[PDB]
């Protein structure tokens, strides 16, 4: 059995500051050096989050600040586990980042986006498909805004080589963008399912995406 469990919780309030963190730990891996590497990074991230809360309660007041972090298992199959961790900072407005890890349960592998594809052409191929998706979305719904062809905002040009991604239960690849990354803040965290028929021949195989 491979599953996420809550391993540290910090809720605390003081002066103009609060924190509400639930941190996951990975258990069940046959490869403990990976399981500990993974769990070490979740804890450094929590520790950093507590540091920023303690720093906002120290010395001179610097305005109201709320820090929140939680986590959710988005994919749990016999072959695959994927875990969403959210990191939300709120002062005037909310700012959400969502990060993922996706684990091959049979082979004890932490998947990178890069490892799914035979070479670097996936970057441009995915970036382009996303531009098309954004365009179609904007067309269908005038309440959807992406920084695509807007003459006053820096447009979305390319995904990063290690862009946030995960893999769904139906074996589809999803790219995720933090808030303010590709769009005004009201749009939230935005994501894009890349149809497999668009990238199939760039894949190493069909173990993960199909």
């Amino acid at each position: 059995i491979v599953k996420a469990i809550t391993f540290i919780e910090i809720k605390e309030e003081k002066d103009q500051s609060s924190i509400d963190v639930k941190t996951p730990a990975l258990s069940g891996l046959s490869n403990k050096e990976l399981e500990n590497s993974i769990n070490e990074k979740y804890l450094k991230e929590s520790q950093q989050l507590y540091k920023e809360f303690i720093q906002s309660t120290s010395k001179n007041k610097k305005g109201h600040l709320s820090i929140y972090s939680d986590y959710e298992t988005v994919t749990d199959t016999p072959d695959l586990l994927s875990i969403r961790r959210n990191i939300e900072t709120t002062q005037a407005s909310s700012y959400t980042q969502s990060r993922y890890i996706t684990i091959d349960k049979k082979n004890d592998i932490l998947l990178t986006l890069k490892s799914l594809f035979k070479d670097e052409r996936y970057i441009k191929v995915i970036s382009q498909n996303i531009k098309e998706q954004m365009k179609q979305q904007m067309k269908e719904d005038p309440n959807k805004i992406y920084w695509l062809t807007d003459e006053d905002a820096e447009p979305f040009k390319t995904i990063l080589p290690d862009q946030t991604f995960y893999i769904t239960e139906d074996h589809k690849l999803v790219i995720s963008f933090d808030e303010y990354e590709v769009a005004p803040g009201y749009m939230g965290v935005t994501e894009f399912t890349i149809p497999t028929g668009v990238i199939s021949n760039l894949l190493v195989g069909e173990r993960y995406i199909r």
Binding site: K61, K62, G63, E88, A92, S93, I145, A153, P184, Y186
Partner: protein, 129 residues
Amino acid sequence: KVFGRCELAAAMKRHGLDNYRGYSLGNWVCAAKFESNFNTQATNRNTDGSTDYGILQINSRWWCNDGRTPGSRNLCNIPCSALLSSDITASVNCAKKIVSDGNGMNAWVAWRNRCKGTDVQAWIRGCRL
């Protein structure tokens, strides 16, 4: 409603945001661009149960009451609904408190990451104020 760029500058000028606590008008427009794309009715719900409201995406954890954010304050003492009007008065008045909370316009991540240290007077350029 969706303000035109210059139309919002003209309106924020009336409401005394030009050089309020030191911030020239371009900053307040730039901020609005990257929060709401100038849409007074924009709403965004977040993981913690809070919501960002309006043209400046003021959030219910601290600044307004929407009755559905357990454990929040209401520092601007307003219903969150008041931040979704086509008149910007209510959002300006809360924004004015927010910039005085102790962090300047840094309390907006949008401003920090898309506006700060840029040529923000450009959001005013071409306008007739």
